[PDB]
Write a protein that binds this DNA or RNA. Structure first.
Lengths: 150, 88, 138, 234
RNA sequence: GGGAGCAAACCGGAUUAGAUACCCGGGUAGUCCACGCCCUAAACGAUGCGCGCUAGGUCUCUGGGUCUCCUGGGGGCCGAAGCU
RNA sequence: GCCGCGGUAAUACGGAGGGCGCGAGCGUUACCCGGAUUCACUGGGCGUAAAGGGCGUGUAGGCGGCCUGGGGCGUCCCAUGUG
């Protein structure tokens, strides 16, 4: 069990004789606040059900956010489909300047100071998965040269 | 077309030295020969356009060369262009 | 006919790497080896060496990759996740000593040509100079 | 002892319908077929069994699978003759990946396995007597080797990976050491402990699978003679 | 200049509520040639040109060889990585 | 303001009770930059979304393989004037 704050909830719909049938999509974020965040998108016949599943699916999908002093290790641009996103680390006591999404995710990420911006499609879902792959691609001076050993 | 025999005459006539199967002087002399030939042709088959195209290329290619020549060396440029009697 | 040989070298490298190959052979070029030397002197590649494909002198460039991975797509991470030329022939890119780039918040590099040799985003800065911002790796 | 056996008739397989990745494991193309390089094979066999051994001695269960006919039977053997779970029939989808749910059937097995011997048989209409009895025939028809341990494997051994790559996948998403005997018609990369060598000729399958189970037992105590291999083996 | 066949327009016949159409019977310019204009198009791969780099499998047209194969040029299908 | 509201139970009109905001001010109309990576150097594009010229030849122009040496215009550094 972590923070567990849901990005967005919606009501999709499908067609069939007699009428349209519904379902619900819930996108949730789950982070401890020490460098662990998970992103799960849950769909099911009812809001609650959706919600929960999002959580479950989330925990089952997390990532080690290599924080540092309260911000990200370095600048990063990540294109994911139509969506794009920039992430720039700000000096301590700066703020988490990002839109609803990258925030909600980055808040639990553990970061307290980071500069951002949504580029291209601002779609939640996609920016969401966008933010993830962003983090999931960060590096530290250590694990950096840790690779260039030789 | 052009007999191997006649084609040679040209080559042997412009070779900057014994042998010399290629080179500017030559490549040019040769193109020319082909050009006029082809020229005289179309001067009869106006309707034969596709072949016309071929001329142009042959034509430009020669332009190119001379340009290089003129650049690299004027002396034997005037020479060649003169002997072939070109640039009208 | 290759307009910018350098941008090529990178691309050849950027491609061979993206597939995980032992070594790649970029055509001989003093100035090229420089970006190479530096590329290695900074630990991005096992190294390189001169060769000859029938009177055709190239340069074997040994690529360095990471450790195998756990899970789907067990494809080993790479040492160079990104190389991209800056100063292109279609738009020369020069920088003053105060203008030199800060590649990947320091984790990165930025090879560049200077009046006094080929240095990097730190070296050149230390030498306190400037020149054609050749490119950036990291 | 090793070489000879293999060199015997257990190498070189699929021809001209390969995978370039697997180009590191192959000597040449004789009259068409790809002659896998045993020299290297050996080396790999090592690291593989090393792992097996470094696991067979630490109380770890392994799951073997082979859904191809030219290798079914044997796999059924080597498994029971080692207490290691296995799959000889249709490798259900989401086994490892949806274990908890697949298990649900395993439980349904005994659910009947018990109602099998009972006085409740006195009643019950022929409708069910046939329904259940049948519902068990198949039930029992697929889990005969997928029950034993009610816990995921620490690894999985397999014949032709690509043939059962689906299992493999499941395994890989769940992080589970993958070991298998693959030939030239397969991609290594997504295989952890690769046993390069023929995947159809039961000749090679038996061998590589045999010395495997023994090795599983050498780390348990009870070295004996081989298992029933010949019965119609050519 | 030439003119068989076909055929906008056109005239009949049907169909239809009407039928300035689809179907039927006729029919001119045109379609052909020479020379000269017009210069448009779903002028389409709806994909500018040049060069370099990045798994294979398959069938097919064409060239060469100390020709079950190797190597060069072109057209199709399936598809690595990657792109969308 | 954009989406839209009102067809006899309107949280959208009009009045009321209440509430939110800012306060000697509060609103409205106009105009400039922003958000607009929506003219894109930073920082975009053209197979089907708007976008490849019907095709070719070629002038100016733009761009240019490998190695050694001279000049040092671009470029880069220092100092000084200036600002």
């Amino acid at each position: 069990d972590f923070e567990e704050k849901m990005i967005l909830i919606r009501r999709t719909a499908r067609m069939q004789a007699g009428g349209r049938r519904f379902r619900f999509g819930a996108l949730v974020v789950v982070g401890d606040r020490q460098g662990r965040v998970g992103l799960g998108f849950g769909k099911a016949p009812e809001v609650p059900l959706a919600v929960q599943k999002a959580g479950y699916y989330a925990r089952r999908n997390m990532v080690e956010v290599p924080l540092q002093n309260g911000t990200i290790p370095h600048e990063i641009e990540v294109e994911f489909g139509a969506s794009k996103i920039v992430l720039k680390p700000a000096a301590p006591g700066t703020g988490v300047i990002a839109g609803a999404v990258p925030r909600a995710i980055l808040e639990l990420a553990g970061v307290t100071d980071i500069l951002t911006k949504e580029l291209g499609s601002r779609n939640p879902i996609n920016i969401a998965y966008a933010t993830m792959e962003a983090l999931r691609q960060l590096r530290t001076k250590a694990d950096v040269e840790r690779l260039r050993k030789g | 077309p052009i007999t191997k025999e006649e084609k040679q005459k040209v080559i042997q006539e412009f070779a900057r030295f014994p042998g010399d199967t290629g080179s500017t002087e030559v490549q040019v002399a040769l193109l020319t020969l082909r050009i006029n030939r082809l020229s005289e042709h179309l001067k009869v088959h106006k309707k034969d356009h596709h072949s016309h195209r071929g001329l142009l290329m042959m034509v430009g290619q020669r332009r190119r060369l001379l340009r290089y020549l003129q650049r690299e060396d004027p002396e034997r440029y005037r020479a060649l262009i003169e002997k072939l009697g070109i640039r009208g | 006919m290759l307009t910018d040989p350098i941008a090529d070298m990178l691309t050849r490298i950027r491609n061979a790497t993206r597939v995980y190959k032992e070594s790649t052979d970029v055509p001989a070029s003093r100035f090229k080896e420089e970006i190479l030397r530096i590329l290695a002197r900074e630990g991005f590649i096992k190294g390189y060496e001169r060769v000859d494909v029938d009177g055709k002198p190239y340069l074997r460039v040994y690529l360095k990759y990471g450790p195998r991975r756990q899970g789907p797509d067990p494809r080993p991470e790479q040492v160079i996740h990104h190389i991209r030329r800056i100063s292109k022939p279609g738009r020369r890119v020069y920088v003053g000593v105060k203008e030199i780039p800060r590649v990947r918040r320091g984790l990165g590099i930025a090879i560049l040509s200077t009046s006094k040799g080929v240095l990097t985003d730190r070296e050149a800065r230390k030498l306190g100079v400037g020149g054609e911002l050749i490119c950036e790796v990291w | 002892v090793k070489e000879l056996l293999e060199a015997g008739v257990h190498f070189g397989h699929e021809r001209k319908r390969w995978n370039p990745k697997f180009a590191r494991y192959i000597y040449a193309e004789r009259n068409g077929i790809h002659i896998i390089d045993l020299q290297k094979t050996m080396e790999e066999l090592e690291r593989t069994f090393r792992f097996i051994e470094d696991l067979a001695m630490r109380g770890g269960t392994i799951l073997f699978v082979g859904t191809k006919k030219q290798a079914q039977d044997i796999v059924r053997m080597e498994a029971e003759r080692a207490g290691m779970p296995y799959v000889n029939q249709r490798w259900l989808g989401g086994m490892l990946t949806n274990f908890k749910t697949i298990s649900q059937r395993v439980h349904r097995l005994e659910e009947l396995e018990a109602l099998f011997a009972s006085p409740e048989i006195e009643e019950r209409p022929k409708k069910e007597q046939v329904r259940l009895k049948h519902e068990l025939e198949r039930l029992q028809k697929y889990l005969s080797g997928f029950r034993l341990l009610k816990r995921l494997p620490d690894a999985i051994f397999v014949v032709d990976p690509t043939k059962e790559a689906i299992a493999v996948r499941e395994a890989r998403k769940l992080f589970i050491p993958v070991i298998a005997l693959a030939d030239t018609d397969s991609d290594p990369d997504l295989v952890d402990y690769i046993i390069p060598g023929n995947d159809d000729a039961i000749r090679s399958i038996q061998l590589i699978l045999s010395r495997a189970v023994d090795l599983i037992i050498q780390a348990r105590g009870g070295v004996v003679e081989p298992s029933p291999s010949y019965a119609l083996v050519q």
